[PDB]
DNA sequence: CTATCCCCTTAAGGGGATAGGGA
DNA sequence: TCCCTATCCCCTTAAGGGGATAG
């Protein structure tokens, strides 16, 4: 049976799984003519016929989680006909990342446009703890994560095609929820565009609650809307197996050229490079193609989405085997001898080397490093002075320590 | 209309206009004065595509372009 | 706005926008990532000009383009 | 004093003659922002500063008559301070070709916007015969020609900045007026876009009256508008001293490429080539750069303007020294050995040779030749059967004869 | 119906020299 | 007597069209 692809209650097209096992997509003519007309993914440009390229499989594939053991967890829960992308999506198709709503072609279904179950402190403690050992959702990423809907003062579970307002993350790293709650607070303080996250506490479990930037209430506050989006694997129609540059995934050059096509090209380009320094400073090595997203805007326009999925690889040094000299950026910078990528081997000269080839305004590269040079210290404070009374002072300590260590490399020049 | 910001979302839009009009790469190429190969290159690899080329094909689509602010 | 039908009437219109915005060939050339010479060539010899170039310059002018029917 | 340049009662900018004899132009800021905004001439693209290039001089120059005698004829009449372009235009500035209205800076002196003197049959006979041995007009061209305004049923003379509706031509060639009046009826009969011309008879004199296509009554019928235009020498910003290709003027390739920028590019490109055949058929050799114009349209757009100034070089053979083998097109076609131009040596293979390099649709060159092949005969009949009872049957005879001679070269293939 | 493919001959943007342009 | 910008030099690279045909 085909899957009809919906986007905020508008028929975009249909996913077809042929005998031969060949995935195919055809845009609904009505959508090709709509006000809201835009490709599902930039790897799948509005046209008339059946789209047959690997971009169709890879795109939809990139809606599901990567660990395909987690895929078995889904084939088990909602009895899937396979671990195939099509068969899985026919079960949890409802709330997927981005803004796509896959409902069987049979599957019309008027599923509650706006319905939710106000959870208790104990039901929450059940749901949170659950993912370790109507809820038709789909979260794509590197670690185990679900999603919820915050309304009024309560954490509720969506019902039907009802959208979620928060991406909730469970502790995998011993305190992944604390590590990322920091880096986020930090990233905001340094002006980087990130989503507001909070920490929810349910009895014993401790979980992270990130506000979704691909979700927005209509003017009337009567409907929650899904904002179409897609990551850098989908944009280039690549399989999630290559999210990392070291595996074939897109790097700076690739992303920067692409961004030239943004609505806010010059601003994004800047923001992007800037983030590449931020990642360096807080030792984040999770900077892969699937961690950068563009919003898709009517007509085929796109603009960089805020940054997300930020963690620091610092609270994992020393006592274990890991060392600062073993931390390498996902995306390499231009070096004297090829391309360097080892954080503790990286220096401002490498960012300016990069900016040199990419033809990124040298002066703006100078301004970024500058701005960091004289901001970091003040930032760490304001953030540290925000950490709730129960925050693991080793996470703070570890990150805050190394940030300065690296920050020195900057202030001695800028 | 819809704001274009790159050679690719450009070629995409125009290729759309060709299909939604029933034209082939061949008939448009004849009218103007370029080879069918060029139209095809433009549609799949518009990055390194000349401006005269692009307007040629613009004309063959009974189309035109205009600048505006990106807001 | 006004319908453009060639590389030349295009460069003219964009050059205008630049002047009536007090920008120099140099400053725009920096923001994007291109040579000042290229902005010059485009302005005086837009026929043989690449499409990425043109969009690069399009962006630096805080502009965008759109297709339309020639009527 | 600077000349304020007006266009249908709109302030475009100002011509300034510097002390060094320097011609310059600056667009009026209010014009750069207008709805109707367009460059005076494509050689003079809208911008902010003072324009100082040769295009400024050449453009305005190409508004006055070719012959420098006609020019003295004007420095006499309206007592000019020189034969200089600026100085002459400061006299006959009002009704110039195209649409421009040059009125001294010291001269709001607003012109009766709509005023005319209904002429008598004798007044006409006087103005017509005059151009051989308030009337501030300017006609650019190869031969001696004035211009009048036809309203109701009377030929009137404009008064002020009142536009004209007919370009009237005087007999120079012994019957130029009759030659062209034939050529026009013919060109229309064959689908070519030319203006409706009539013959006016005033006592003894015999003149040709061509309807201007650069003139148009507003909706209300209360204002006569001038349509901005310019010829191929102005468009390329060349001096009228090079209107002929053999002198350095633009030819087919040049015109064609340019036309590619037209609003009606593909149609224009066709008509133009088509007209290259017509001129060949009626042995017209006056096909020079100043005989092709484009209308200037809001924004800077342009389309080909009807064809004009058509005369046949046939009634001038035999009894004089001139011979068919001495007739050469103004603009050359691609040949085996370089480029051929001699009418009596030209064949269809040449037009197709040309289309070949220019990359003009070979199939459309085939359709043009073919259409002519099977229309000429019918055309000549319908035109002949229109010639007034008092039409010099030698003109008819001479043209109609050689046309078939050449036409034979076509039918024999198409 | 597109898309490479062998071959081309007028040469993109650009490396950053570089010299009148105009106010 | 000075910023601005139309050019101008040398190497990597090479529009695309030109025309035979390959999924």
């Amino acid at each position: 049976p085909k899957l009809v692809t919906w986007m905020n209650n508008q028929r975009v097209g249909e996913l077809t799984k042929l005998a031969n096992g060949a995935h195919t997509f055809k845009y609904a003519p009505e959508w090709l003519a709509s006000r809201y007309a835009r490709p599902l993914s930039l790897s799948l440009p509005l046209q008339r016929g059946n789209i047959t390229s690997d971009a169709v499989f890879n795109f939809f594939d990139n809606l599901l989680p990567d660990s395909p053991i987690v895929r078995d967890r889904i084939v088990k829960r909602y009895h899937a006909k396979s671990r195939q992308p099509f068969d899985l999506l026919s079960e949890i198709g409802r709330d997927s990342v981005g803004a796509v709503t896959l409902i069987p072609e049979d599957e019309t279904v008027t599923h509650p446009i706006m319905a939710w179950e106000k959870l208790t402190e104990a039901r929450l403690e059940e749901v949170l703890t659950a993912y370790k050992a109507d809820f038709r959702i789909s979260v794509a990423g590197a670690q185990e994560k679900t999603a919820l809907l915050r309304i009024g003062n309560d954490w509720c579970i969506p019902k039907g095609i009802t959208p979620t307002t928060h991406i909730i993350k469970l502790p995998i790293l011993s305190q992944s929820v604390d590590n990322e709650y920091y880096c986020l607070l930090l990233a905001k303080e340094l002006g980087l565009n990130v989503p507001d996250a909070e920490i929810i506490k349910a009895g014993n479990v401790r979980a992270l609650a990130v506000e979704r930037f691909d979700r927005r209430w209509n003017a009337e506050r009567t409907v929650l809307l899904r904002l179409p989006q897609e990551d850098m694997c989908q944009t280039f129609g690549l399989p999630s197996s290559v999210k990392y540059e070291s595996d074939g995934g897109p790097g700076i050059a690739r992303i920067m050229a692409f961004l030239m096509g943004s609505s806010e090209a010059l601003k994004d380009r800047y923001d992007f490079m800037k983030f590449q320094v931020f990642q360096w400073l807080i030792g984040a090595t999770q900077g892969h193609a699937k961690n950068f997203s563009v919003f898709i805007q009517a007509g085929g326009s796109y603009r960089l989405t805020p940054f997300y999925d930020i963690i620091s690889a610092f609270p994992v040094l020393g006592g274990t085997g890991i060392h600062i000299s073993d931390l390498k950026l996902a995306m390499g910078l231009n070096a004297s001898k090829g391309k360097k990528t080892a954080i503790d081997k990286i220096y401002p000269r490498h960012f300016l080397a990069t900016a040199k080839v990419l033809r990124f305004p040298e002066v703006q590269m100078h301004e970024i490093l500058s701005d960091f040079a004289r901001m970091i210290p003040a930032a760490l404070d304001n953030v540290k002075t925000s950490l709730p009374t129960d925050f693991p002072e080793n996470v703070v300590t570890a990150v805050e320590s190394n940030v300065l260590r690296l920050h020195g490399r900057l202030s001695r020049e800028y | 209309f819809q704001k274009i910001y790159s050679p690719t979302q450009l070629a995409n839009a125009m290729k759309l206009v060709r299909q939604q009009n029933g034209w082939t790469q061949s008939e448009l190429a004849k009218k103007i004065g370029i080879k069918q190969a060029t139209i095809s290159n433009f549609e799949n690899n518009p990055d390194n595509t000349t401006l005269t080329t692009f307007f040629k094909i613009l004309q063959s689509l009974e189309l035109s372009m205009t600048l505006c602010d990106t807001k």
Side-chain angles (χ1 to χ4, degrees), chain A residues 1-219 221-414, chain B residues 1-69 71:
Chain A
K2 313 132 208 66
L3 280 163
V4 177
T5 305
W6 295 87
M7 227 156 212
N8 290 305
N9 285 182
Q10 299 220 56
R11 183 184 210 87
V12 189
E14 305 181 347
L15 183 50
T16 314
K17 184 184 62 191
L18 310 175
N20 56 215
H23 302 74
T24 53
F25 190 96
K26 182 177 190 280
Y27 283 108
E30 49 189 275
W31 172 257
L32 282 187
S34 173
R35 248 159 297 272
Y36 294 75
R38 82 198 71 195
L40 203 54
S41 151
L42 299 181
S43 57
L44 303 170
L46 302 185
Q47 55 201 70
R48 298 193 62 181
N50 300 306
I51 322 316
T52 48
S53 88
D54 292 330
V56 186
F57 177 74
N58 288 340
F59 169 71
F60 280 111
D61 184 37
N62 271 306
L63 297 187
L64 311 164
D66 281 89
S67 176
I69 305 141
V70 182
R71 295 200 177 201
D72 257 72
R73 284 191 157 175
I74 283 72
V75 192
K76 162 71 186 309
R77 289 160 188 165
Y78 319 87
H79 271 50
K81 286 184 184 181
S82 187
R83 302 134 356 170
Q84 286 291 168
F86 190 94
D87 298 306
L88 287 174
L89 289 167
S90 301
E91 304 291 312
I92 82 289
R94 301 196 200 159
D95 195 298
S96 196
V97 193
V100 325
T101 302
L102 291 167
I103 308 277
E105 149 206 15
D106 12 330
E107 231 105 302
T108 292
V109 199
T110 288
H111 285 290
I113 318 294
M114 289 271 75
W116 63 74
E117 200 269 87
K118 172 188 73 174
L119 297 179
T120 85
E121 208 223 299
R123 284 202 89 302
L124 183 74
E125 182 166 353
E126 186 178 89
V127 186
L128 299 173
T129 54
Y131 284 79
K132 272 179 287 297
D134 274 5
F135 200 92
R136 302 311 195 22
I137 326 169
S138 199
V139 201
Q143 245 46 63
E144 174 71 298
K145 52 177 189 178
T146 180
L148 282 202
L149 161 68
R150 176 95 185 298
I151 307 191
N153 271 313
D154 321 318
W155 292 91
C156 323
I157 288 179
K159 298 149 84 169
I161 58 174
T162 304
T164 41
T165 66
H166 288 73
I167 296 293
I168 302 175
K169 298 191 174 180
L170 326 314
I172 315 168
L173 279 307
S174 307
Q175 304 158 288
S176 74
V177 161
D178 296 295
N179 185 317
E180 168 166 45
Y181 169 78
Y182 192 69
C183 280
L184 280 178
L185 285 183
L186 189 54
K188 184 184 180 184
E189 199 59 47
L190 290 176
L192 287 164
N193 190 212
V194 288
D196 296 309
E198 65 185 59
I199 294 189
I200 47 183
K201 292 143 52 182
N204 62 73
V205 58
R206 190 179 184 178
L208 185 59
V210 182
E211 200 179 11
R212 307 190 65 153
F213 52 73
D214 52 12
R215 295 285 184 280
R216 178 168 72 214
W217 283 101
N218 72 332
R221 246 287 190 308
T222 77
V223 188
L224 191 63
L225 291 165
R226 293 194 176 71
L227 307 187
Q229 79 172 74
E230 73 170 343
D231 54 49
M232 295 301 190
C233 275
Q234 303 170 289
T235 273
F236 302 136
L238 304 169
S240 67
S241 56
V242 286
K243 57 172 161 302
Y244 286 89
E245 177 176 27
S246 63
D247 294 330
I252 301 176
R254 192 83 197 285
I255 311 262
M256 285 278 301
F258 174 70
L259 282 177
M260 246 304 311
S262 173
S263 314
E264 283 283 327
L266 272 12
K267 177 177 198 312
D268 289 7
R269 284 167 60 80
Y270 189 75
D271 296 342
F272 186 74
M273 297 298 295
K274 191 181 167 184
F275 197 65
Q276 295 313 307
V277 171
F278 177 75
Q279 306 204 87
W280 172 65
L281 294 175
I282 76 168
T285 38
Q286 302 285 62
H288 61 61
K290 276 187 70 69
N291 261 350
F292 294 89
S293 275
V294 308
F295 288 112
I296 304 289
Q297 305 160 168
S301 293
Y302 56 99
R303 56 178 268 258
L304 211 60
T305 69
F307 302 106
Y308 61 92
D309 281 12
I310 319 173
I311 156 196
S312 179
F314 284 161
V316 187
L317 299 167
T320 58
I322 312 78
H323 242 150
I324 188 67
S325 59
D326 282 303
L327 299 177
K328 318 295 200 65
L329 291 173
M331 305 180 172
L333 316 177
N334 287 66
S336 34
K337 312 164 62 67
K339 302 177 53 179
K340 287 156 191 171
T341 167
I343 267 71
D344 187 281
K345 277 286 178 186
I346 295 303
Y347 273 85
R349 74 173 191 284
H350 296 139
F351 294 94
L352 289 168
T354 312
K356 263 300 161 196
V357 300
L358 305 185
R359 263 159 274 127
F360 181 53
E362 185 200 279
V363 52
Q364 293 181 47
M365 197 56 251
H366 277 311
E367 176 196 351
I368 298 176
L369 296 179
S370 191
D371 281 328
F372 277 145
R374 78 148 193 283
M375 274 185 78
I376 265 60
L380 295 175
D381 267 317
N382 284 278
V383 173
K384 166 220 306 299
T385 62
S386 299
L387 299 170
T389 10
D390 50 293
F391 197 80
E393 295 201 52
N394 33 280
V395 183
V396 195
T397 299
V399 177
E400 184 168 0
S401 166
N402 296 248
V403 160
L404 292 169
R405 186 204 181 318
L406 299 166
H407 172 299
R409 286 197 184 85
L410 275 188
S411 49
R412 269 168 248 158
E413 286 186 63
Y414 297 80
Chain B
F1 205 36
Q2 348 157 301
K3 307 183 175 180
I4 287 116
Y5 301 65
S6 72
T8 291
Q9 109 148 280
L10 212 215
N12 291 339
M14 288 167 86
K15 179 206 193 59
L16 206 200
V17 167
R18 175 173 60 84
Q19 289 185 157
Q20 288 215 273
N21 262 102
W23 302 317
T24 71
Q25 292 190 355
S26 304
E27 44 179 332
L28 298 189
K30 289 175 61 185
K31 293 180 66 181
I32 51 189
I34 68 177
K35 305 178 348 202
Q36 176 265 151
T38 301
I39 302 285
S40 172
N41 175 83
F42 170 65
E43 287 195 345
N44 304 279
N45 270 45
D47 271 15
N48 316 290
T49 296
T50 293
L51 280 180
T52 44
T53 301
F54 158 67
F55 280 92
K56 291 191 172 187
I57 299 176
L58 230 214
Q59 293 273 26
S60 74
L61 297 180
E62 305 199 350
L63 262 36
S64 171
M65 62 146 306
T66 172
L67 301 166
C68 61
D69 293 311
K71 285 184 282 67

